[PDB]
């Protein structure tokens, strides 16, 4: 868990201020499960770590070296389009998993703020946005069979537009 | 977050329990009734802390246990949202569902299966508490679908009996009619927003959201009851008092309205579905009520009595008041469920009859549920403190404090008042008359499983409104700005009704014959709503199914064309070509005219 | 549910089943029983009236309009006894109504226990493979040969035999 | 005995030769074993990568 | 019926129990890894890139 | 793969030269094996799919295939075992065979990179099928129904071969992968529109169109369990599988010379579901519940759409097995009372306490009950067709409403009155045949809690 | 009319083997047969299978795919560059076409 990546931003928990004489269960019911749930349950998670500490393991996050892309790739080779596609696939789970790490940082601060979620919850939603609007541009409308072949072409379908509107 | 979370989780864990003993080998060595009577009981005082720990802090929490998949940018998993809702319907609920097992354990006696009736039970309850904790659609929509199939295995527990398979398939086909909104409003959420969860759907504020209302709307109706879709409910009678009393009174019936409440969010800014809730909820205040003034059954008067608190609770829903439609939800279940309690009671004190018509002298002859059910009467009727008034009170003050329609405004109120007109209708019918039930007489209804159950829930229903609304956080601001004569306007209707009710029951009496009317015999029949859609709409669909389809497309049309003309084609041309006769003399005039047009060929084109 | 309608119904069972009805649903109408004796007494002053009466015509054609005036007068939601019909009750413990041949399957550690039980229902077979040829017989010999026929059974007489087609009268299940 | 329990030496026989044939068949295409842009190692560790 | 009930527990219990207690026990003392970053001079082989125990056994003995 | 198809072949002279008394059991427990053994193609740890060799490949499509048939096997073993009982011998060795063959035809087909080899077995599946059907059912008009199914299938395979070939001419290969890493765009034009048509018109029959529907009925209800079975699993999605390998190639022209198919497959799809409420042979309503399920399938693969796909073959799964075990269920009562009418046997569940659970639970899938594949996959094609055009949810409703009605007349007309006291003849329940149904449920539990294994390529 | 046995009659398996299993007629076999399935479909293959399928790891990548996003992310809100862009391959190495 890195903060940065999920924020979880901090807690203001204010004072108990007990304005009566009257008792509060919670309190004791609160004690006396801290005493007959966590205690034991924190001690057999101690034991299981002890066992780890003294057998520990280590292991790795993959690197993938970067291929030639499609733009340097030929016209009915396919020893380069099979690098390319595969990691056109590499990146597109992986956007995925962007795209989804975002929404998941949405829904902790609208369920956070509540009642405040429409003036304190505006960077996200805006980010939430600007990555719809990249995964749009990028794999919108590709279809089942998609491909870096097709994204290129959604890429200069999109540009020649684009350069259209800047001459004119 | 350890005691909340924990305490929310082992209600689940305790309920899931009796099942697994149910696959186990133990049931035949245990008192399964008591066993799972007592996890009820221990899943209630669990779920009576996060109660607590909300009145203080009013914090809610959204759990997340477990991964279920990723769909390319759409996961899918187990999440709980407790909030007020969840955690108050969970104890009500709880507490509710252990009277009627005990309750269950008394009147169900002599049936062998009763071990198989109590694990249809709770396998109803852990359905329904997956529908009020869920923090997503497809989860609510199992817990939808759950309630939905619960009901055709319990309408049909006696499955000899040729009426309740066709209410249990009556219900199966409405709910199913719901679900097609339900789907509908779930495929758009997923598409104009990529997910099924209530936070990502609450920043579509300010879209249109027109359409998915609509069909959450025919999800509420189908589930609820509702002019359109209805009649199920009544239909439902056909199970035990028990099934009668949980999945008819108190839950499986408050599921539309806890949707729309949870989706309330959006409701707030469309007043076209505000306006036919208004103008629909309504609608059933007042048809029901009707039909609940000349039906001679408990259950079918208990029924249609239910059906016109939900269209009441959606009247209030369609006037921006989900709070209030929520906090009638939870207090009407307590006497409505007492009433079932007693009308049981009752039934199996005399030979399994329900026709008010063949019974009478209840307030002397068994006093505590004549008590009991009085209570319940007044508490339904909206007595000024038991339990009614907390939350009637204050429906029936916005209804005319609102800019609203003036006929709704009306027609509930209407309803309002035969509600004590039928209350009164029993009361008189079954605990003031003569005795016209047959002459042997075994009543006994001193049994703590019977006794102890009722007492609990008259208790719940005198103080849990007092104990509810003197808790609960204030998320809406009501107007105790009026006039006397909108102030006191349900008190005061209600005992116009009850007098009205008085006399022409006393007319009742007094030797004059009863002439069949018009009026009567609509309210009677329920308006032919069945009488006339369960014979014409079978009878189309099915002689479509049959001449069309099956015959006239399938065995003739789609047979005669492409097979049958293959068939007959190459058959032709087969008997053509070998209609030969062994003449050399033709053989070789045929060989003629082939050397005749080859040549011709070749000196043609060339 | 014991015998079998006859090929046509005769104006006196007629006449009886419309007073039978007329009265049941006056009690449907009339919730006291005071109210319930007086119109009955009524009814059947009504129908005394017109008990000496021989027009055959004219019986039929009272009758007709009496059942006219029923259906017009009819109580739609009538009283109807649990168990019958129509009732709350009706084939309910169909579900528990299991046949007697289920038990020819049962396995020998389950009729183990049982056992005076099952000697008995033995000796009840021994006293159904000896008393069907003769039940055939009765009826074969007891046959009308003029062609008219109707769903009626006779008894047995002799000292020993039993009345043909038992079985399945006896033997069928408890109601419950 | 055998005549009867020699038939339990098939059908596990056939699972060792389906993966014999397919280390024949992976003994071949054998090119590009260590040409791939991706997965150009050094062989410092061993001499044969697959 | 209640037989082919019993004997499909049976045989199903026959060989989970062992099992379950064999996940257990593994998941007590062994315990899952932990993410290393990777010395730069040593090549990591196909198993040292997965988590549990069972899966890297699996694969180095296996795949 | 070949590890997977070599002990298949094995199977057969263990077969043989088994004792009359122990080639069953020898040849049931090693084909559970087979099963066991098919797993490894599940050991997918990257987005690189599985190339054993320049004739076979797996995917994340038909690795789920694969393994289905290679379970179905052990499970037709033991329900074609009561009857054939008395037949000899000789016989019964000629029936594994026949099935053992099935599954390594059916093996190769969907582990296979070649279209043409892909076409050979896809064609060669009707040796054994036409045998079984013919040989071992128990009417007069098999006959027909064998007839029917050969030529239709047939019918629809000549033009698929001839564009294959000129394919192979164009493009110097069939071979997948290849065909998609070097596929072109077309000209629009009404030879292309002909070789879309020939393309897809094969698969369009195995899997019944609504207008081509008029062998799957026949075929079920003349047929054998086992025959059944397989016909309802696999043979059934031979077409799916093709459609989706060779959809690839066609493209732009689906976007238009799809739209008579996805109306045929709405309509049919009620038009089908409606004969499942007023047909009275057991085993038609659930050929007509298989077409109206495949219609979906159909429509689905013509939008070409991820979720489109993932429900495709959700749906594809979950159907085979539902299916299977709604035929098997049906079977025990014909083994009992030798009729297929569904009216006649009623109050059932009395006797049979048990069997109406598993008749309940192959019902609460057919009718979509969540969580369940069958569902998860319903709602994506709907979803995806929803996208499409919003107009199609009213038809989906009504095809949901129908299946609701359909399924629980099933249960209730045989399982859910009172008795046919006069049935003396229902011998209790079998072990075997309850452990049918275990082996058909307990699978789609385990792959509604995994269902990652099922979505497909796109997943 | 012409030669040809007569329709058989229905036959109970139960009477003579009570602990019939639905397999043969032979008890042992019928047991054997029996054990068989319930030893190689239940107690293997849905338990080892459902243990191996289990602990397959990283299946097609979707835990890899989640870890090395995380890593992305972070680089990227670190060094101030945005979560994604418009144009996956960059515009420079592209050469459009002049209309
Ligand atoms: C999103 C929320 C998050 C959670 C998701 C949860 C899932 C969604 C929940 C919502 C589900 C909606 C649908 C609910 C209604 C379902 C309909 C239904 O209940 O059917 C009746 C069904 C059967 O009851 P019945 O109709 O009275 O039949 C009794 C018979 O007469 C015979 O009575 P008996 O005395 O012989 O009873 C002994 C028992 C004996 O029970 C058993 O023997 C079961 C075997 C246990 C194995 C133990 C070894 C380990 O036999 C039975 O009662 C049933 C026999 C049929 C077996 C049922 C098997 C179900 C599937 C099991 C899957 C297996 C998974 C593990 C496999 C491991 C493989 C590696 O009800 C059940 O008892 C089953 C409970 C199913 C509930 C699951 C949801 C839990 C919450
Ligand atoms: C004194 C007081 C002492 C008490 C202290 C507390 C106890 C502490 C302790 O014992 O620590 C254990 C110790 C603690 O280690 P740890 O710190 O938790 O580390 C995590 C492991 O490294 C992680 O390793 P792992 O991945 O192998 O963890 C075990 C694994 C277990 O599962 C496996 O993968 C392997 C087991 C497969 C069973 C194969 C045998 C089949 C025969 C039966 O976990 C799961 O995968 C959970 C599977 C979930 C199954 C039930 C899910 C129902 C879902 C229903 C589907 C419908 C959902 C609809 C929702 C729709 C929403 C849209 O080791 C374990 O955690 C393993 C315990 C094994 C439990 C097995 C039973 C789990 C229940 C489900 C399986 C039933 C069998
Ligand atoms: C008593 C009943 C016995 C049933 C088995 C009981 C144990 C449960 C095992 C089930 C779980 C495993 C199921 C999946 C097996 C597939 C894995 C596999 O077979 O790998 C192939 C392996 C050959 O390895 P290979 O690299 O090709 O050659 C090197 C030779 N040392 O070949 C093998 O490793 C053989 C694996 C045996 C499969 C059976
Ligand atoms: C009961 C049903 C009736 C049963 C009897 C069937 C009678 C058969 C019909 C008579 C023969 C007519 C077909 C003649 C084929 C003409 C050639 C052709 O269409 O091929 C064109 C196309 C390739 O053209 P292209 O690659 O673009 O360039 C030029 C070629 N290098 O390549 C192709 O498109 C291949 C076309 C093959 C023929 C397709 C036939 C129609 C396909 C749809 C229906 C399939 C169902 C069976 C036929 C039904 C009746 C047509
Ligand atoms: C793909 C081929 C298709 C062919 C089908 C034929 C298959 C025949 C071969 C036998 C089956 C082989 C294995 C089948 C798949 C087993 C999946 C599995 O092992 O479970 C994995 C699961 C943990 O999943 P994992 O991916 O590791 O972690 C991410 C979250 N899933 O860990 C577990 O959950 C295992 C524990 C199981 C506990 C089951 C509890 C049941 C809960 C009730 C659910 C009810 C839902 C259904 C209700 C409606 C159905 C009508």
Redesign the interface.
Known sequence: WDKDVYPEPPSRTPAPSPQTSLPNPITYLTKAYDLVVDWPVTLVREFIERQHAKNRTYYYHRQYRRVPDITECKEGDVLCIYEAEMQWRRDFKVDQEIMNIIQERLKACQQREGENYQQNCAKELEQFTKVTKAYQDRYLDLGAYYSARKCLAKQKQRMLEERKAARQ | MNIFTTSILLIFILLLSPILISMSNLIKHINFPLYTTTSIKFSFIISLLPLLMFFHNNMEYMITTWHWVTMNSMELKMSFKTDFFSILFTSVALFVTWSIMQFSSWYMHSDPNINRFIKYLTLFLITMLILTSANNMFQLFIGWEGVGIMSFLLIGWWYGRTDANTAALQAILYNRIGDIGFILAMVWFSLNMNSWELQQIMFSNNNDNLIPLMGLLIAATGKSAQFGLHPWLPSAMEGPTPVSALLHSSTMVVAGIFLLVRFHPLTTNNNFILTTMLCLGALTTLFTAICALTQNDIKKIIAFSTSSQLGLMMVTLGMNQPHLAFLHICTHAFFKAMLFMCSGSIIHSLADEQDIRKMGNITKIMPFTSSCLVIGSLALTGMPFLTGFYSKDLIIEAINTCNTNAWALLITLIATSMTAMYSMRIIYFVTMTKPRFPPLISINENDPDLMNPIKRLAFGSIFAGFVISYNIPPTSIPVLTMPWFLKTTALIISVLGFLIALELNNLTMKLSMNKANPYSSFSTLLGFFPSIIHRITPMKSLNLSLKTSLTLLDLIWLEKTIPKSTSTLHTNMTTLTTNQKGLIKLYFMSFLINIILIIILYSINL | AFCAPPAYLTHQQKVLRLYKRALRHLESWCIHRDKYRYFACLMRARFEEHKNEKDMMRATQLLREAEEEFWQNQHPQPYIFPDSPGGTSFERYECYKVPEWCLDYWHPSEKAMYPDYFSKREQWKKLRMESWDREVKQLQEETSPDGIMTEALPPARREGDLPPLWWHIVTRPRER | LLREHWVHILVPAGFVFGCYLDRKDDEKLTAFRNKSMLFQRELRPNEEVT | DARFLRLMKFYLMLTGIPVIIGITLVNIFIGEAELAEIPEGYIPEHWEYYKHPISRWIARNFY | ???????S???L??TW???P??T???V???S??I???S?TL???????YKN??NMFSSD?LSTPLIILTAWLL?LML?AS??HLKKDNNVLQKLYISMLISLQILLIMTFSATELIMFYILFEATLIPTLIIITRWGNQTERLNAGI?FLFYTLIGSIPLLIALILIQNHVGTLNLM?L???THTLDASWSNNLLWLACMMAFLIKMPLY????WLPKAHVEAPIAGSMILAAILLKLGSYGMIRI??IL?PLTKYMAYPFILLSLWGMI??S??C???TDLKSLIAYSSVSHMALVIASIMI???????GATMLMIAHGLTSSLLFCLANSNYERIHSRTMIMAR?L???F??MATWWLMAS?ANLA???SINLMGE?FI??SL??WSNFT?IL??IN??IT??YS??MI?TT?????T?HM????????????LM??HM??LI?LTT????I?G??? | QWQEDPEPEDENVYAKNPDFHGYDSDPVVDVWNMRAVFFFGFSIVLVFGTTFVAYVPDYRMQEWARREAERLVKYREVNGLPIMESNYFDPSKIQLPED
């Open positions: 793969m070949l590890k997977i198809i070599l002990p072949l094995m199977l002279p263990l030269l088994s004792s008394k122990k069953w059991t020898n049931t427990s090693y559970f094996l099963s066991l053994t797993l599940l050991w997918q740890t990257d987005e690189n054993f060799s994340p052990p033991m075992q009561n029917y290849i998609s890493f070097t207008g081509v529907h008029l959809s690839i493209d038009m089908t409606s004969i409420l007023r047909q070409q759409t991820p979720w489109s796909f993932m109050g569940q009395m006797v306490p048990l609460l009950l969540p969580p709602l709907t979803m929803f996208s949810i989906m409703g949901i409403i609701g009605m629980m007349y209730i399982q859910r009155g009172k008795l006291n003396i003849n229902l011998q209790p329940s079998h072990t075997r045949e309850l452990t275990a082996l307990i699978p385990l995994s269902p990652k294994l979505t390529l796109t997943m």
